[PDB]
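yo

u said u wanted the structure for the complex thing, so here. seqs first:
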Amino acid sequence: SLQMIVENVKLAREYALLGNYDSAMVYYQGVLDQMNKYLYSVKDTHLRQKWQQVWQEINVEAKQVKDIMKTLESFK
Amino acid sequence: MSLQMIVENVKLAREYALLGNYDSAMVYYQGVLDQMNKYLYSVKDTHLRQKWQQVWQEINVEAKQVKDIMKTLESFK
Amino acid sequence: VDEDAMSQIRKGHDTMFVVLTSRHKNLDTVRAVWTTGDIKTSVDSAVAINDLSVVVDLLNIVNQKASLWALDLCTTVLPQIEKLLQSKYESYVQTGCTSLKLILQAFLPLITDILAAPDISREERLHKCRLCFKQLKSISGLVKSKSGLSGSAFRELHLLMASLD
Amino acid sequence: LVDEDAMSQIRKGHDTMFVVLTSRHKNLDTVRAVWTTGDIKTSVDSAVAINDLSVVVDLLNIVNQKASLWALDLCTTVLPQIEKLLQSKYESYVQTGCTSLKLILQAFLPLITDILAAVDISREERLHKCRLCFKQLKSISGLVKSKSGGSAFRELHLLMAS
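structre next:
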């Protein structure tokens, strides 16, 4: 479902904006996998290329959340 | 100037210092050092005076250690 | 459709990048002050950053760790206090009484709430909480026995420890 | 009481004082070094590990004199942020502010109340920050009472009855 990928992207970003990084990471990892399964479901090669940069941009957001979490783990 | 009072005030300074009451110890240490120095120049004998000077120095050493302890403690603030 | 789906997802990417990068940078500023050990200026720097989301992130860490910090402190300090309360030097006893009062005032409410509750972090708190309560019960008997002296500090401590008898 | 007897009585105890204060200062400096590195935890363990009760007394005397002032300084810095969190449109911000406020009320309010009771350059400063703290709490109190009309604010309301 495309509406699920869009929705799950929205949730990951909302959780991240609110500092709920645990829940954000679950959805970021969810969308990255879900986006990859739809990616190889795409028969068009060009449409596949454009989704790959969406995956890349979402992947960048997920790495920043991890970096924030790693910083927070130092306070322990 | 009573010598038995100087002995007592040395005893008080040391007791407070042993117990970690450094503010009160310094009051008596500065007291004895002044009281002993005021008595020191009352001594006309040269030999008797030198021996009191080394007593004063030993008390001064103890007073300096208390000061040093207080300075170390003030670092924690 | 793909065009609407991708357009909606990419719409928000630049804002997310800026928010998370800036928040990460601000947290790193605070973390640097924290590792030096200065609790005061690390709280001050978070406020000075003037970013409520950084304050939220840090208070969320404090809120989950504060009780464990207090419990760890208590389980190390209480045996020392017990020694002080048994000292033949009056001032040592007085020092132990003052420190015990502060612990009871500040930390006993937290300890009560932990023992009154329905993963690994909760189990660790409950474990240290139970030891801490064991130490306080031991100290409690000492406090009650010395409240018969006249000696008044032990009667105030007895009152603060009423929830243990 | 003659001079020779007086000097003998005084000097008898000098070597003991020198050694005791030397050992204690060395032990306190050992603890201070761990403290200045910033690790509060291993610095407490340092004093215990030294196993010298007089070092513990000196350190607890400092803590006993500063702990309430530390809580007071922290509260007057944190409470304005907490009040902002309680006013946020984000549910999770409010919950964070409520949780931090409960811990502050449980742990630090008893200490701060006692400061107002019982020469001293700081005393003028202490009372000013005490009043600032109670102004902050009074402001939060009215907000808590209004929003208790929700369960977290009822728990907070009872903690703020005073």
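The domain at 1-77 of chain B is CATH 1.20.58.80 (Methane Monooxygenase Hydroxylase; Chain G, domain 1). Chain B touches chain D at residues 3-4, 6-7, 10, 14, 17-18, 20, 43, 48, 51-52, 55, 58-59, 61-62, 65-66, 68-69, 72-73, 75-77 (CB under 8 Å).
cya
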